[PDB]
Amino acid sequence: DGVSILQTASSGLTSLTNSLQRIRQLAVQASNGPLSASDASALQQEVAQQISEVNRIASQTNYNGKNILDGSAGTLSFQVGANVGQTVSVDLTQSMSAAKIGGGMVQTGQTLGTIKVAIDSSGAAWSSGSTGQETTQINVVSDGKGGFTFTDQNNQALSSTAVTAVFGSSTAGTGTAASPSFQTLALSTSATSALSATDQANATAMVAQINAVNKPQTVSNLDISTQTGAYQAMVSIDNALATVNNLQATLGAAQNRF
Numbered sequence: 001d002g003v004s005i006l007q008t009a010s011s012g013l014t015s016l017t018n019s020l021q022r023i024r025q026l027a028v029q030a031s032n033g034p035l036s037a038s039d040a041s042a043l044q045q046e047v048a049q050q051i052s053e054v055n056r057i058a059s060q061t062n063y064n065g066k067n068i069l070d071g072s073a074g075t076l077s078f079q080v081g082a083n084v085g086q087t088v089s090v091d092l093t094q095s096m097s098a099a100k101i102g103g104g105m106v107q108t109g110q111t112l113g114t115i116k117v118a119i120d121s122s123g124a125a126w127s128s129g130s131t132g133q134e135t136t137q138i139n140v141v142s143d144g145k146g147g148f149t150f151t152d153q154n155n156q157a158l159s160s161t162a163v164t165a166v167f168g169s170s171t172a173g174t175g176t177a178a179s180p181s182f183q184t185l186a187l188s189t190s191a192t193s194a195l196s197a198t199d200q201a202n203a204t205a206m207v208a209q210i211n212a213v214n215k216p217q218t219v220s221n222l223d224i225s226t227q228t229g230a231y232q233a234m235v236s237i238d239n240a241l242a243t244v245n246n247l248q249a250t251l252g253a254a255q256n257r258f
Helices: 002-031 037-060 160-167 197-213 227-257
Strands: 074-079 087-092 111-119 135-142 148-152
Touching: 002 037, 002 074, 002 087, 002 227, 087 227, 111 160, 111 197, 148 160, 197 227
Parallel strands: none
Antiparallel strands: 074 087, 111 135, 135 148
16 A cells, blocks of 8 residues: 555656656757757757656556546555554645646756946946956856845955945845745846947846746746757756655655655
């Protein structure tokens, strides 16, 4: 009973790992350099096939005809001993369907993008009047709570004055796994006003990238046919794999108690 149900669930999770790991490699392939329309279409077709397999695993993994990986099994309990209350409980309340895994917040420490800028150490636009060192790039790094930390072209943290002066005062994430939430990256006009029109446009596009990568789709809605979509897929799959690994670990802990 309990041991066999746990094995059936764990088998399904291993199938799911295979398909998620496959989407990761496809996303890597799609993000390495420029792609023709035909190559982008072909790569996304492969992702769609894997999404279909994820949905099959979620809708069809079953024990004696009863689904166990679509959330519908709930919490199961098994008697292991003679003590009243000597039971092992197994939480199968979370669906593994593509619509219900991935998404969420980017894990901490990931570089979301790099913006070319022209500012002084206080975050003011660089000019012939400026002194000290010029900041020429800003790397935007996730904090695991839907917000950001920032380094310069030499990987040194921006001063707190420069962070505030360029990005405003809502950069720190406040989300939790239980209640996710997302900051909106906003770049000052002063960060790029000294640069060419083309550099200003490039920065705007990078900020849009970063904001999209910060809010990845669930596995169901991944599309790797654009660079931003491929980057969103990498984050989303990292998160989906973490969800699957957490669940595998809990199944294992339950098996151990039998």
